[PDB]
């Protein structure tokens, strides 16, 4: 029934071997969880989606991994309630294509659509529109969770099961297997964006642009960010901001099918873009690259500037940098986003990199920030627990729901969440 398999995250690092169950039969999945539970836990089980997480959260060395990608049925779409009811293995590209004709838009879109609904929930993913829409968790109306007791719990965000529900959002699969979920989509009349572009010349100017009050005028906003230039050109950014377009905003040619599927000069106004236009590690790493993401609380703006400073001075040079100001956070104890300054950098693997990122960890930690489980397989339990003050609250919920540790992963063991 299972296939022993070498697994890594997307950046192809920290491999381990697991027995992979890959079946479209939900009953086989229930059986397998039950079997692990009846062996008393053993080395446990974790779910896997499309493997786009860079870390070790979707692998389980010496244990069971359940590939959820064959559970990919879209059960219902409702344009009045805006609700879609889909299997957890459904991916966002497939969902985008299916929902567009109903005038529905996937409410949170990350940098790639090759992620499953299960993975979107388990990592509580965020997008270019976080400051207006929150993260993926905010839009989950209900979900079916297969728990350690072999039963499938129906969870809602305010029901009796609220606590389990919000430990599951951002829970990295460690409360059980999300089988199915109901997501509230965003209404739209077109599949296009209308975007305003701006360029800055300094880190301070980037920050002022995000603090002047104009962010509140766009539903989506992110920026490419210079991390190699010494000050004051350090932290200059190419900012892409916008909102979904109405039909009467489209070029006349595109009005026939508005819901169709698919420095210096970079200043513009009312440019009309499809998703691809508006929006290396796997190809070259991990002989090549270490991806690194963190968020610093809004009020700690100067501490943020300094970390940026430390990065440019490091001698570790990242071209691919993405910056964004996160909005308010949600109820999930282990959710990554907090309101604040968020950035992803991609470092070439070079001598002294490990020691340098350990120093970064310390700084993000002291300044009240955190790393993202979706981008990590290197940090320590001590660092992670410190970055997530609600971790003991979350661990308690997990103990109530999985007393025998039927659910387990490489990440759970490394970060002592098991």
Ligand X SMILES: Cc1cc2nc3c(=O)[nH]c(=O)nc-3n(C[C@H](O)[C@H](O)[C@H](O)COP(=O)(O)OP(=O)(O)OC[C@H]3O[C@@H](n4cnc5c(N)ncnc54)[C@H](O)[C@@H]3O)c2cc1C
Residue 92 CB, nearest distance to ligand 0T4 (Å)? 13
Q: Is 342 in the site for ligand 0T4 (CB under 6 A)?
A: yes
Conformation bin of residue 150: beta by default, left when phi > 0, alpha when psi is -120 to 50: left
Residue 202 CB, nearest distance to ligand X (Å)? 25
| Sign (positive or negative) of CA dihedral 375, 381, 383, 385 | positive
For residue 302, give the nearest of 339, 260, 337, 340 by alpha carbon.
340
Which of ligand 0T4, ligand X, none does 52 bind, CB closer than 5 to 8 A by kind?
ligand X
Which of ligand 0T4, ligand X, none does 178 bind, CB closer than 5 to 8 A by kind?
ligand X
346 is in an annotated binding site: no
- By DSSP bridging, strand 16-22 and strand 64-67 are parallel
Site string for ligand 0T4, 279-318 (x = CB under 6 A): --------------x-------------------------
Q: Which of 46, 90, 106, 140 binds ligand X (CB under 6 A)?
A: 46
Q: Which of 191, 344, 374, 397 binds ligand 0T4 (CB under 6 A)?
A: 344
Q: Which of 111, 231, 288, 309 binds ligand X (CB under 6 A)?
A: 111
What span, in angstroms and rounded, lies between the C-alpha atoms of 135 and 126?
5
Which one of the spans 30-38, 44-52, 311-319, 379-387 is the region binding ligand X (CB under 6 A)?
Answer: 44-52
- Backbone phi, psi, residue 310, to 5°: -60, -35
Q: Is 320 in the site for ligand 0T4 (CB under 6 A)?
A: yes
Q: Is 139 in the site for ligand X (CB under 6 A)?
A: no
Burial class (CB in 10 A: 0-12, 13-18, 19+), 388: buried
CA–CA distances in Å: residue 323 to residues 61, 270, 279, 296: 34, 22, 13, 12
CA torsion, ordered 48, 39, 403, 72, to nearest 10 deg: 20
- Quick one: tokens of 61? 């060395």
In the bound state with ligand 0T4, the residue whose beta carbon lies nearer, of 110 and 173, is: 110
CA–CA distances in Å: residue 336 to residues 137, 233, 274: 11, 29, 28
Cβ atoms 235, 318 nearer than 8 A: no
Q: Is 324 in the site for ligand 0T4 (CB under 6 A)?
A: yes
Which of ligand 0T4, ligand X, none does 320 bind, CB closer than 5 to 8 A by kind?
ligand 0T4
Residue 355 CB, nearest distance to ligand X (Å)? 26
Residue 161 CB, nearest distance to ligand 0T4 (Å)? 29
What span, in angstroms and rounded, lies between the C-alpha atoms of 356 and 372?
18
Q: Is 128 in the site for ligand 0T4 (CB under 6 A)?
A: yes
Number of residues that bind ligand X (CB under 6 A): 31
Hey, is 100 helix, strand or coil? helix
What span, in angstroms and rounded, lies between the C-alpha atoms of 368 and 139?
26
In the bound state with ligand X, the residue whose beta carbon lies nearer, of 170 and 258, is: 170
Q: Is 275 in the site for ligand 0T4 (CB under 6 A)?
A: no
In the bound state with ligand X, the residue whose beta carbon lies nearer, of 49 and 286, is: 49
Q: Is 57 in the site for ligand X (CB under 6 A)?
A: yes
What span, in angstroms and rounded, lies between the C-alpha atoms of 170 and 166?
8
In the bound state with ligand 0T4, the residue whose beta carbon lies nearer, of 243 and 413, is: 243
Which one of the spans 120-128, 202-210, 247-255, 385-393 is the region binding ligand X (CB under 6 A)?
Answer: 120-128
DSSP for 153-164, please give it. EEE-SSSTTHHH
Which of ligand X, ligand 0T4, none does 68 bind, CB closer than 5 to 8 A by kind?
ligand X
- Quick one: tokens of 8? 């890594």
Residue 309 CB, nearest distance to ligand X (Å)? 25
CA–CA distances in Å: residue 93 to residues 97, 109, 271, 329: 6, 10, 24, 25
Summarize the annotated binding site as residue ranges. 47-57, 111, 116-119, 123-126, 178, 372
Summarize the annotated binding site for FAD as residue ranges. 47-57, 111, 116-119, 123-126, 178, 372
Q: By CB under 6 A, name the binding residues for ligand X.
A: 10, 46-53, 57-58, 68, 88, 110-112, 115-116, 118-120, 122-123, 125-127, 172-173, 177-178, 374
């Amino acid at each position: 029934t299972t296939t022993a398999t070498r697994l890594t995250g997307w950046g192809r690092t920290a491999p381990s071997v697991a027995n992979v169950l890959r079946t479209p039969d939900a009953e086989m999945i229930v059986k397998a969880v039950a079997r692990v539970a009846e062996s008393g836990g053993g080395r446990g089980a974790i779910a896997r989606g499309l493997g786009r997480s860079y870390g070790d959260n979707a692998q389980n060395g010496g244990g069971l991994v359940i590939d959820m990608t064959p559970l990919n049925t879209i059960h219902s779409i409702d344009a009045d309630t805006k609700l879609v009811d889909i299997d957890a293995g459904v991916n966002l590209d497939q969902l985008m294509k299916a929902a567009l004709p109903f005038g529905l838009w996937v409410p949170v879109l990350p940098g790639t659509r090759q992620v499953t609904v299960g993975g979107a929930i388990a990592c509580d993913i965020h997008g270019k529109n976080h400051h207006s829409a929150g993260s993926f968790g905010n839009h989950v109306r209900s979900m079916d969770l297969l728990t350690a007791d072999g039963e499938i719990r129906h969870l809602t965000p305010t029901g009796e099961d609220a606590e389990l529900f919000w430990a599951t959002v951002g829970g990295n699969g460690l409360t059980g297997i999300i089988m199915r979920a109901t997501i509230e989509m965003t209404p739209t009349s077109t599949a296009y964006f209308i975007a305003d572009g701006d360029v800055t010349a300094s880190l301070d100017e980037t920050i002022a642009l995000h603090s002047d009050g104009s962010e509140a005028r766009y539903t989506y906003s992110s920026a490419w960010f210079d991390a190699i230039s010494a000050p004051p050109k350090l932290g200059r950014a190419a900012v892409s901001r916008g909102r979904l377009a109405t039909v009467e905003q489209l070029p006349a040619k595109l009005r026939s099918e508005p819901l169709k599927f698919d420095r210096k000069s970079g200043t513009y106004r009312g440019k009309v873009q499809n998703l691809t236009q508006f929006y290396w590690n796997r190809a070259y790493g991990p002989a090549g690259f270490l991806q690194y993401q963190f968020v610093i609380p809004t009020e700690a703006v100067d501490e943020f500037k300094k970390i940026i400073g430390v990065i440019q001075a490091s001698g570790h040079y990242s071209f691919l940098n993405v910056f964004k100001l996160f909005g308010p956070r949600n109820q999930a104890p282990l959710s990554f986003p907090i309101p604040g300054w968020n950035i992803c950098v991609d470092f070439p693997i070079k001598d002294g990199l490990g020691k340098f990122v350990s120093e970064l960890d310390r700084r993000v930690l002291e300044f009240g920030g955190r790393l993202y489980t979706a981008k990590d397989s290197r940090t320590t339990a001590e660092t992670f627990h410190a970055m997530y003050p609600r971790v003991d609250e979350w661990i308690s919920v997990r103990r109530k729901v999985d007393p025998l540790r039927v659910f387990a992963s490489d990440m759970a063991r490394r970060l002592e969440l098991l």
